[PDB]
Amino acid sequence: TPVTLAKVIKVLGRTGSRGGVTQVRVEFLEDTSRTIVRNVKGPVRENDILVLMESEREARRLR
Amino acid sequence: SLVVQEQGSFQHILRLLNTNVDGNIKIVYALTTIKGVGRRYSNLVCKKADVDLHKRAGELTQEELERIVQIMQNPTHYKIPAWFLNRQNDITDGKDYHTLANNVESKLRDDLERLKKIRAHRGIRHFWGLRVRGQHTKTTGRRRA
Amino acid sequence: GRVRTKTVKRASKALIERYYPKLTLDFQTNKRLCDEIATIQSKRLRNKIAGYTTHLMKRIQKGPVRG
Amino acid sequence: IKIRITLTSTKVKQLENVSSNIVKNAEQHNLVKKGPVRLPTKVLKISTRKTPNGEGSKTWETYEMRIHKRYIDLEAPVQIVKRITQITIEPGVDVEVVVA
Amino acid sequence: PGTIVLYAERVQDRGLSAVAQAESMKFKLLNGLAIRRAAYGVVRYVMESGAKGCEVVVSGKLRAARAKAMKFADGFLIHS
Amino acid sequence: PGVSVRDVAAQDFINAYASFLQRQGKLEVPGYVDIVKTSSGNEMPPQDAEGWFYKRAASVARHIYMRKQVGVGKLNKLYGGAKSRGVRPYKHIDASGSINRKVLQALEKIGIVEISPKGGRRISENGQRDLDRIAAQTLEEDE
Amino acid sequence: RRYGKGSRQCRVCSSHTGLIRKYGLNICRQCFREKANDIGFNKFR
Amino acid sequence: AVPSVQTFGKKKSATAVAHVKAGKGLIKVNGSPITLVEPEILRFKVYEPLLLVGLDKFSNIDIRVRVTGGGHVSQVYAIRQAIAKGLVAYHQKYVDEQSKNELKKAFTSYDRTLLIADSRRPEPKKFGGKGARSRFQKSYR
Amino acid sequence: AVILDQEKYDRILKEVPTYRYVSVSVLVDRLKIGGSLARIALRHLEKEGIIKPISKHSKQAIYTRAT
Amino acid sequence: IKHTLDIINVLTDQNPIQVVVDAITNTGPREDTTRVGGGGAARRQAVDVSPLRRVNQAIALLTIGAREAAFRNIKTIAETLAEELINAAKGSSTSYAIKKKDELERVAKSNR
RNA sequence: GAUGAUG
RNA sequence: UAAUUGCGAUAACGAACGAGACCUUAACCUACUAAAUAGUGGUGCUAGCAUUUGCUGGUUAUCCACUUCUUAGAGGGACUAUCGGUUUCAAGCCGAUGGAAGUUUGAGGCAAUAACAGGUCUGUGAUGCCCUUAGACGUUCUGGGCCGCACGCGCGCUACACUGACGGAGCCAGCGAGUCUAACCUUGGCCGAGAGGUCUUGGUAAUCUUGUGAAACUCCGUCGUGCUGGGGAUAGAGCAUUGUAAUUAUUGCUCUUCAACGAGGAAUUCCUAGUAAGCGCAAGUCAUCAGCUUGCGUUGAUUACGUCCCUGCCCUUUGUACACACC
User: Fold this and answer.
1) E strand or H helix at H49, and its extent?
2) Which residues pair with residue I39 across a beta bridge?
3) Superkingdom of the source (chain F)?
4) In CATH, which of 1.10.8.50, 1.20.1250.20, 2.60.40.10, 2.60.120.560 is domain B13-78?
5) Which CATH code is given to the segment(s) E18-80?
6) Which of B5, B25, B57, B105 is the most buried (most CB within 10 A)?
7) CB B80 within 8 A of CB B48
8) Nearest one of F80, F21, F85, F79 to F53, comparing CA atoms
């Protein structure tokens, strides 16, 4: 299956009962000007590149 | 150093002192199956017998084995120092001996039975099966039997 | 954290209200002035006092500081 | 006349009054001397449980007594050596003078 | 004999030695003076002598079977 | 250019000198070379039973060349190891005093060492000649 | 008698256990803490 | 006298002293060539200050090092600091400023420790454990 | 196998030159000679010039095919 | 690692470092799962994996498999690691690293 | 918004 | 903000203890004052290899100089200084340059009020009251025991092996201690397989033991996935050391005997960098005996830079039939 790439443009906060899940907003490389918010599992900064296995799943917040 | 081919006369076991010894183990460590033949008794005997230690135990010719065994049985005769043997100043004889094969256990049963008939503390403990070298028995050696 | 205690806040304030014309923005200069204008018991506390006095001096250049 | 005057005290302040006295006194008599040689400080540590009875969390305590030693060498006439050994007696400082 | 000699000297600032004051109170208590009278006696003298603070605590069987401490102080002491 | 013992790796020199002495054959060997083990810390006697004594002599020869003096004690320290002690933990244990004494007495009878003021042994003018001569050969064999 | 726990006692309280012998103090650990300041052992680090 | 310079480097307790003077290109550590330094695997740590700036600079000089303290690994790091420091101090006193600056720029851009010591030092033990921070095991029944 | 017959000695020389990389272990899983006998095999094949060394070390011997 | 880099060049006639890099970039799992629950009852939920952690978990898998494959084996450590790095960079399901990656990403897809 | 009695 | 640390707000105003300051120690100084009981260079004498003025040592009875490394006394240095972002823009916070050093620079010492019916009368010639006080619970002598073993638990030490065991070589620390109403730490020589024995010697110590030539570690070899050269329990026999005396083996050495243990169930401990962990040394006890404790150094990662889910802590608001206070 295809895989799409996106670029973190902001880090919103932290979630999970124990803080191991940061929340980010991203900008897709191809077809930019589409942004999605989703959760990540390890340390992360601005300008990082994330490989998204499925593009269209916007992620919920525990608070 | 190079590889050398060998004949098909290899024997895979050999009987010494009524025990069978594997032939696929280096010569020094092969004899260790014989009770009494410990690690440093094989090393010294095998070099008094002037055998090439690098060969396997099944690589030896018939004469070499009997050469080795003869040394093993009367070690002092070939100048194995007294302090290499397992029995010295025998309690009944005053002589020195090295004990091999079945003699090791038989002598052992004779050692305890001595203390038992004398009824010494050591002999008492052995008959009871407990630890005899001053250890604590409160927390140790529970499931020994 | 680099918060400064009341001993530092007030000793620095007490020097500006008496020695504005003689104080400068230089830490090295202010540091030597505070030897002749005060009796302090340690190099560490003296350095901190002179440091915060310098900090307030920059503030006054921008305008009046409260209090 | 070679002499070696040594000093041992547990507190530096008193010991620098004595040492500074010795060197400044010798230079006004223009004697020849070594400098005040300062040997490594040797510290004494005692470790001990605070508790006097064995109960409670295992809390250990350490103490320290410090010893500062110094010596100077003098080559001076005996008459001046006599009064030198006599002056600069101070509590808490110990002095020994050896000839040759 | 003849090498060790003992000298005496009257202690300077009699009212600012903890040994002197504590010993003063011990004899007062053995004679039958009250605990409250004694403790404030020590405090008042020390403060008159120029001290910046005093504190005296007496713990034991002051009044009944149970043991308790009791504190007296003046001025401002430091602890750390 | 000249050459000194310090200009050649330790591993090469020790084998080179040990061989030279083995060919030369006048070093005295104490006879118990088949029974003794080199320390109480060990459990098996040397594996190279033929040449272990010659190797030890070479090591001591270089060891003196570097430094002023040594004694049988200093060599026991240096050739100790970790005793097993079984269930209990390890501990440094000193080496065989007999072996190290009879390699220093042997080295004197060959003229490589001498007793020195201030105790212990020391290199001799003849000792330095032999070791230095063999170092230059070992370099030559770098081809 | 020439040796052992019975040959040594705290010079202050006659106690037999806990005695410290370093530097020839020979004072039991309890009494040492009491007398430490006078002997000259202070608490620094 | 011939030009000379004395410098030093440290790591943990190891320390090495490098005497440097105008010469023919000798580089000996502990009275032996630099080629025989042990442990073997780390020989290129000692060679690094030479290679990084070319062997040319070292032709007109003699360098003699000596090491003490620490252990097998920490000593090697002391040697490499002494050699780099000696070259910079020599160019300070006997060549010119520019050469010292450009040298320093190469050494720093690769590895800072070649010139500035490592500030780390060990922590004391604290009673109640086998280490500075570790503790003995606790049990409740 | 601890010692080798002719049927094995010839077996070595006829298959070992095809191995991309050979070592003490490679000669023990392709053909079943022991660990000890693999080491003498390596040194013999080195002298005879059938295999090259890339590096030599006490614990890890690396060889490759001759060129 | 001096021995292992050497074995890679012989076995593949390719730059050995580049093989190590490829092994890293083919093992870092892209999607993982996190425990999530309320009051004590819990379940899994899918999340994305960050760049740095992709490298971290890559290295751990490559060296854990190489360590476990050599234990109680005739092969040396430099060899088992050499085989592990060669297979993973090829994308071969024989490697411990690759198989584990797919186990993590399969679970993640089922817990979206 | 799963479970959690007693001294 | 680490902090009842500050900015402020304000029916409160001015104060005191605690935190911070303070002290100890670890990092830097080619700058002051010095120093063979610490060092380095040069020069007298000298051994070896080459010999052009070279390379490495010896000589602490040669003497001269010097202070980079080592020691201390007195001082310098850091204050988040400077610069850029950020909050009414105040306290602060994030990042970068420079620097030995920028998580209050790292680690400690000290450390309030008020409490526990916490531990201790077996540290004390510190103590009230009860008991005992000569056929004694006083004091002391001989001999036992506190070590006894069907089982249950808590600190630990060895391991279950090729990232290894064994053999020969390589070769490096820091913190310490050492002789009076006297035998301590021991170089060196010689005998002995070993433990150890004997004759001498220095050190009442930056002087000598002691570069405490320590272990893990590197290199070159032997063995080859075999409860095997992994493992060394449990046993037999002999030689030694300390002690009046070792039997219930005090401990050390030598040969032999060669068990469980194949990575460990429910559970559960410790830890954020010279830290965890691997490795050993000195000191405390000590005639002898460390698998323990207090410090010390050598080798040196992985993983967060967060959260309030489990266990708890501090502050505010709120309900209570609790006050021995949710047991």
Assistant:
1) helix H43-51
2) none
3) Eukaryota
4) 1.10.8.50
5) 3.30.1140.32
6) B57
7) yes
8) F21
**Which bases of chain L are contacted by protein, using any atom under 7 A from a CB?**
1-3, 5-8, 16-28, 30, 33-35, 37, 40-41, 47-51, 54-59, 68-74, 76-82, 90-93, 100-102, 104, 106-114, 117-121, 123-126, 147-158, 161-164, 166-174, 176-179, 181, 186-196, 206, 210-211, 213-225, 228-229, 231-239, 243-244, 247-258, 269-281, 283-287, 291-300, 302-310
Phi, psi at B23, each rounded to 5°: -100, -5
Q: In the CATH hierarchy, which fold is given to the domain comprising A1-62?
A: OB fold (Dihydrolipoamide Acetyltransferase, E2P) (2.40.50)
At position B15, the amino acid (one-letter code) is: R
Q: Which residue type sits at F111?
A: G
Tell me if residue B97 falls in helix, strand or coil.
strand
Tokens read off for I4: 């080798």
I8: alpha, beta or left? (left if phi > 0; alpha if psi -120 to 50): alpha
Elucidation technique:
cryo-EM
CB proximity under 8 Å: H 35-54 to F:
36
Q: How many residues does chain E have?
A: 80
Helix (H, G, I), strand (E, B) or coil at D73: strand
| 3-state secondary structure at position E59 | strand
Do you find a cis peptide bond into H39, omega within 30 degrees of 0? yes
Decide: D21 and D7 in contact? Cβ < 8 Å: no
Resolution in A: 2.9
Q: Where are the alpha helices (DSSP H) in chain J?
A: 2-12, 16-25, 51-70, 77-90, 96-110
Question: For residues H5 and H86, is the Cβ–Cβ distance under 8 A?
Answer: yes
Torsion of Cα atoms, D85 then D88 then D92 then D93, to 10°: -50
Q: Which two tokens stand for residue J30?
A: 């892209």
